[PDB]
Design an enzyme around this catalytic site. Structure first.
Site: not given
Ligand SMILES: [Ca+2]
Length: 223
Positions: A40, A84, A175
């Site tokens: 992602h 992912d 983040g």
């Protein structure tokens, strides 16, 4: 990272920052020419930054290397975040030393109760935003699959694990995505998702790297 501690400069030598004009995701150096991160986090125009502590100041140990090839997992599903994981090849090999070093891939999966180190430059608040300039660290245990599935009904696949604290207060956050979860000196997880950050009964969810070692090795051997 919410509720963590300042790692100290270059004490997490496999940690990278992915930069597209700014830091946007973490990653892990797994050999001199390859980084693993979260699918992602994909975008074009990635520069990999190694040897970072303060990402806004040049401190002397950095290596900045652009990506030559990105490979998102063939079965990545952006709606569920199953699989992912992505691989990034560097245009040239990094120079490895005590402050820029690879992390080993796991030969076996880690069990619930194992303590791991999670690191990144993400948000440090559960409510609001405050982004640190220096790398933050968190020690956290892997949670049982039953507690993970109870926390996120209908959402946890065999390619995910939970780590953190059901009481809240300590977690990865926005983040930190793509960054490492290292347990006993092996890369066991990738920061992937969670509902908010550091909320009660909502631990972090991490890509289970031990399920991908064959794909990683094969892909590196052929690219
Ligand atoms: Ca720096």
């Amino acid at each position: 990272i919410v509720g963590g501690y300042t790692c100290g400069a270059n004490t997490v030598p496999y940690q990278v920052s992915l930069n597209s004009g700014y830091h946007f995701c973490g990653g892990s150096l797994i050999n001199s020419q390859w980084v693993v991160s979260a699918a992602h986090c994909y975008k074009s125009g990635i520069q990999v930054r190694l040897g970072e502590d303060n990402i806004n100041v040049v401190e002397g140990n950095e290596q900045f290397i652009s990506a030559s090839k990105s490979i998102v997992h063939p079965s990545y599903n952006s709606n569920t975040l199953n699989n992912d994981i992505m691989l990034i090849k560097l245009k040239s090999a990094a120079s490895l030393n005590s402050r820029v070093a690879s992390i080993s891939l796991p030969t076996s999966c880690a069990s619930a109760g194992t303590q791991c180190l999670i690191s990144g430059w993400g948000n440090t608040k559960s409510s609001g935003t405050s982004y640190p300039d220096v790398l933050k660290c968190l020690k956290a245990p892997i949670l049982s699959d039953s507690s993970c599935k109870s926390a996120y009904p209908g959402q946890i696949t065999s390619n995910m694990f939970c780590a953190g604290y059901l009481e809240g207060g300590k977690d990865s956050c926005q983040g930190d995505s793509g960054g490492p979860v290292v347990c006993s000196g092996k890369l066991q997880g990738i920061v992937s998702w969670g509902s908010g950050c550091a909320q009660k009964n909502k631990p972090g969810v991490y890509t289970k790297v031990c399920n991908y070692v064959s794909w990683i090795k094969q892909t590196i051997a052929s690219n």
